């Protein structure tokens with residue numbers, strides 16, 4: 001898979017990566033280090 005975020009960068013916060021599976025696995029795969 002390509003490793004990008006699919007929402008605007010400034011939405012991909014440390015807090016959302018910690019507390020939302022949606023952010024980790026769908027919206028912010030790059031910023032949350034899912035890839």
Ligand SMILES: [Li+]
Pocket residue numbers: 021024025
């Ligand atoms: Li996850």
Ligand code: NA
Pocket residue numbers: 004005006007
């Ligand atoms: Na992107």
